[PDB]
């Protein structure tokens, strides 16, 4: 199906405790493949997936160099942002960036991404046209003006439509045995008496990849959206994910409830009962 590559940058200032720490991680879909940490004894872009290891020294040297430059640029940005908001040098602040590309089954660019957040709030984003910006406030407008004058959007467009998609395609091929393999959820229902009057039915999905999944409870064929407890999808630690959905049911009425599971690893959606 469709695929994505994403880089996630986080820089956090820490007045009195050195310069802002820069962390970078790279993902293809739900699989991390690289990491960089400016606090590391010897900061280097490092492999986090088996299929990226085959890349040569030039790859690792070039990407390390880019990460080191980005470490410095983020520190400049943090200084600028502090000023844009009239903030003191005493506080700690966070700058986040995510960027990358989405491709369809034919490897064609679907969409490009490039956006930033400051202290957890959206700050500025490259629009889907890859040619204009959306600024959240008057501070981000300053950034926008700078980047328009420097024609940053055009440079990003070139990267997103070229380099980004080319690397994603390469990664998808080199790691095809995993990246292009959907692992279906292993599903079952458990029953947990609460009292004489009711019990919990919990629908489980385990060992699935990618993370995207839909679990729903129906009663008499009606979705129980408002009455269903859904936990956040969580990593098992072996590349796969887990999730459950639970409803509280009247004792003896269990058979009126059905769990429905959708996942790209499944030919047809599953229906489960206690």
């Amino acid at each position: 199906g469709s695929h994505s590559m994403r880089y996630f940058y986080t820089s956090v200032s820490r007045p009195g405790r050195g310069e802002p720490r820069f962390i970078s991680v790279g993902y293809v879909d739900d699989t991390q493949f690289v990491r960089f940490d400016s606090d590391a004894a010897s900061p280097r872009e490092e492999p986090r997936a088996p299929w990226i290891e085959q890349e040569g020294p030039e790859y690792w040297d070039r990407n390390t160099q880019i990460c080191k430059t980005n470490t410095q640029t983020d520190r400049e940005s943090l200084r600028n942002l502090r000023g844009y908001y009239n903030q003191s040098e005493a506080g700690s602040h966070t700058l986040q960036r995510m960027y990358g590309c989405d491709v369809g089954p034919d490897g064609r660019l679907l969409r490009g991404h490039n956006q930033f957040a400051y202290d957890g709030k959206d700050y500025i984003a490259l629009n889907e046209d890859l040619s204009s910006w959306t600024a959240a406030d008057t501070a981000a407008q300053i950034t926008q003006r700078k980047w328009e004058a420097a024609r940053v959007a055009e440079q990003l467009r070139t990267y997103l439509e070229g380099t980004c998609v080319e690397w994603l395609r390469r990664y998808l091929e080199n790691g095809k045995e995993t990246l292009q393999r959907a692992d279906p959820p292993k599903t079952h229902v458990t029953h947990h008496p609460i009292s004489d009057h009711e019990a919990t039915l919990r629908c489980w999905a385990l060992g699935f990849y990618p993370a995207e999944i839909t679990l729903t409870w129906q009663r008499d064929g009606e979705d129980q959206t408002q009455d269903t407890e859904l936990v956040e999808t969580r990593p098992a630690g072996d590349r796969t994910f887990q999730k459950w959905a639970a409803v509280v049911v009247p004792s003896g009425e269990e058979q009126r409830y059905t769990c429905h599971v959708q996942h790209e690893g499944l030919p047809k959606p599953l229906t489960l009962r206690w």
Partner: peptide, 9 residues
């Protein structure tokens, strides 16, 4: 693989 465009906010 990373973008090589260098522009501070």
């Amino acid at each position: 693989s990373h973008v090589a465009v260098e522009n501070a906010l």
